[PDB]
């Protein structure tokens with residue numbers, strides 16, 4: 129048992145591992161039924177892990193929303209950093225999609241309404257996430273794992289690559305997962321918040337079809353494909369509802385200037401459909 133302020137965890141209770149973070153399930157020391165996810169340095173990449181966890185704190189301390197994984201507390205010291213986060217009892221969308229293969233349009237709508245809500249807050253604060261992928265979309269059912277799936281709440285996680293972007297500036301750091309990167313990101317161009325909208329379009333397309341809209345053998349191959357193809361049209365299955373078709377087509381615009389803007393996303397007919 130290690131303690132971080134009012135919370136405790138055992139390194140036995142590993143729930144996830146990446147190059148730059150290790151995450152343990154923990155609990156409040158007084159309210160043992162309050163589950164938490166404790167994110168810790170990966171000492172294999174000490175300096176970068178410490179930097180990214182510190183940036184995550186800096187960003188998440190400004191973001192309170194149902195659909196953003198909550199930061200309950202944190203502890204930054206000279207040689208280590210902890211984040212005590214909301215525990216999402218449903219795990220990640222990558223694993224959920226692996227088991228479900230594809231999601232109904234109604235489930236995609238429920239999830240995307242929640243992602244849109246979180247993105248409204250990021251956009252209003254001037255923050256871009258830059259690492260949206262299914263592994264960073266977490267699921268939580270307030271009625272418990274075995275409850276009605278209509279009750280699944282979605283939370284954006286992993287803000288270590290996030291930044292403020294001034295409205296007259298562009299970003300240029302290579303961030304994210306290549307299969308979810310906007311073309312402008314993987315082509316090492318300048319980009320803005322619309323790069324996240326491409327990532328969201330890729331996630332929605334994967335939910336709908338079970339595959340990438342633009343398949344490639346490697347990140348290098350995907351970059352070459354984007355470089356060579358100045359128009360990108362995803363194949364929309366003919367059973368797709370018109371609002372979801374139009375949402376996908378507008379998000380998966382190769383050129384960020386042509387891509388759906390945030391106001392269009394937040395008010396998209398797909399999101400207000402019954």
Ligand SMILES: CC(=O)NCC(=O)N1[C@@H]2CC[C@H]1c1ccc(Nc3ncc(C(F)(F)F)c(NC4CCC4)n3)cc12
Nearest residue numbers: 141143144151153165197213214215216217218219285
């Ligand atoms: C010991 C135990 O109870 N294990 C549960 C477990 O391993 N599960 C449960 C269901 C699938 C997998 C899993 C992964 C992640 C979560 N929850 C969660 N909540 C918050 C965070 C976060 F706050 F840290 F983001 C988080 N991050 C992990 C690292 C891989 C995704 N995971 C829950 C689970």
